[PDB]
């Protein structure tokens, strides 16, 4: 049989880089989850993989602004995936 | 209220 690392095949999607806040609009949901779901629903049926989709989430969340504090939010995936990850539909 | 986590 073959052996791979114990910690292989993980994908961690963080809403923010370390040390920083992530935003929640009480009337809409969070910047990260709402962007993630929109991108998954649009791109998974096209066969796009999750790292491409999460790159788009980074792009979209990066264009949002907190105009009370002049704040931004930078999501951050980390992965030990060894293959492309698609969610066919 | 209108803002983070």
């Amino acid at each position: 049989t073959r052996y791979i690392p114990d910690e292989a095949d993980f994908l961690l999607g963080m809403a923010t880089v370390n040390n920083c806040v992530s935003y929640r609009n009480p009337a809409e949901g969070t910047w990260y989850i709402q962007s993630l779901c929109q991108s998954l629903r649009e791109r998974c049926p096209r066969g796009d993989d999750i790292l491409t989709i999460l790159t788009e989430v980074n792009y979209e969340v990066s264009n949002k602004d907190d105009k009370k504090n002049m704040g931004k939010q930078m999501p951050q995936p980390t992965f030990t995936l060894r293959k492309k990850l698609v969610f066919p539909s | 209220x209108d803002x983070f986590x």
Partner: protein, 152 residues
């Protein structure tokens, strides 16, 4: 390009830990005396439910979990038989700080302690299979600054 097999119906479980009520943190943890209830979090739980049901996952939602309750839920899924699944997804919606998420009680769970419940040794029926964690929480209390760039 090699691609993970993603053919089973359902694809796997999609856990949702949806933390809203932080009254216990406010009462018990002095530094969290003002951390707010996470009003509107159900909109994310619902969006994730719609999205991942459309992608053929079985949704397993849990509301308002202390740290001890979170570990208990993860233990239940670590001990489940995922042999007929192709994937596992866990979404955590909560408050957090550097490297951690908070339970509704304001206790801390390091993120590595949550993901490492599903390593290949702890959950062999997911060995070789993608394990996906989405963490919607703060990771500190600093604001991320903006930088000016030219428009695309």
């Amino acid at each position: 390009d090699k691609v993970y097999q993603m053919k089973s119906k359902p694809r796997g479980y999609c856990l949702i830990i949806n933390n809203h009520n932080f009254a216990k943190a406010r009462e018990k943890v002095p530094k969290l005396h003002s951390i707010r209830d996470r009003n509107g979090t159900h909109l994310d739980a619902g969006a994730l439910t719609t999205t991942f049901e459309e992608l053929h996952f079985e949704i397993k939602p849990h509301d308002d979990c202390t740290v001890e309750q979170i570990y208990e839920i993860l233990k239940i899924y670590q001990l489940m038989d995922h042999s007929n699944m192709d994937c596992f997804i866990c979404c955590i919606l909560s408050h957090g700080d550097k490297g951690i998420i908070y339970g509704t009680d304001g206790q801390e769970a390091p993120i590595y302690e949550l993901t490492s419940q599903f390593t290949g040794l702890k959950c062999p029926s997911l060995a070789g299979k993608p394990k996906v964690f989405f963490i919607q929480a703060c990771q500190g209390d600093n604001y991320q600054k903006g930088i000016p760039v030219e428009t695309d």
